[PDB]
């Protein structure tokens, strides 16, 4: 069981892993246009951290986009394959992600949430009330009136997972 950053380097190996992850995303996010998931996952700005089982099988992951100069990143997609849910993987992934973000000098995590989703990120430490100056993400992260923008502060020396 590994949580590795999956590089989109045009190799058969990584490409396959990214595709498997993309398929888990669409199967688990039915309201999301599959081609839209494809677009983001493989674009120049996004990165993915995968939950790798037996160093070959993808069972989950999180797609995100860092805004390095601004020191914040947006979570695009998060998911664990159906037959592997409710085993603590999703929470362990999020913790590995925060630790990686802390190491990447990222100060805040932002993500849009709807319905149930909101409850999930609240349990993952995200809040509706932001402490990050609005004008900081304005212009970088699209402002949708239809979704709840949530944020998680990444303190420089709090221990998240490992």
């Amino acid at each position: 069981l590994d949580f590795d950053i999956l590089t989109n380097d045009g190799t058969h190996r990584n490409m396959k892993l990214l595709i498997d992850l993309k398929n888990i995303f669409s199967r688990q996010l039915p309201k999301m246009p599959k081609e839209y998931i494809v677009k983001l996952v493989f674009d120049r700005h996004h990165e993915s951290m995968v939950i790798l089982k037996n160093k070959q099988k993808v069972i989950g992951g999180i797609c995100f986009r860092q805004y390095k100069p601004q020191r914040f990143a947006e979570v695009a997609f998060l998911a664990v394959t159906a037959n592997e849910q409710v085993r603590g993987y999703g929470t362990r992934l999020m913790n590995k992600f925060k630790d990686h973000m802390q190491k990447q000098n990222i100060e805040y995590l932002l993500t849009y949430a709807d319905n149930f989703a909101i409850g999930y990120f609240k349990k993952q430490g995200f809040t509706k009330e932001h402490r990050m100056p609005q004008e900081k993400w304005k212009g970088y992260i699209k402002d949708y009136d239809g979704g709840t923008l949530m944020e998680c502060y990444i303190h420089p020396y709090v221990d998240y997972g490992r």
Partner: peptide, 8 residues
């Protein structure tokens, strides 16, 4: 992160 309830 499009979500419509469910999600186990």
């Amino acid at each position: 992160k499009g979500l419509g309830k469910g999600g186990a």
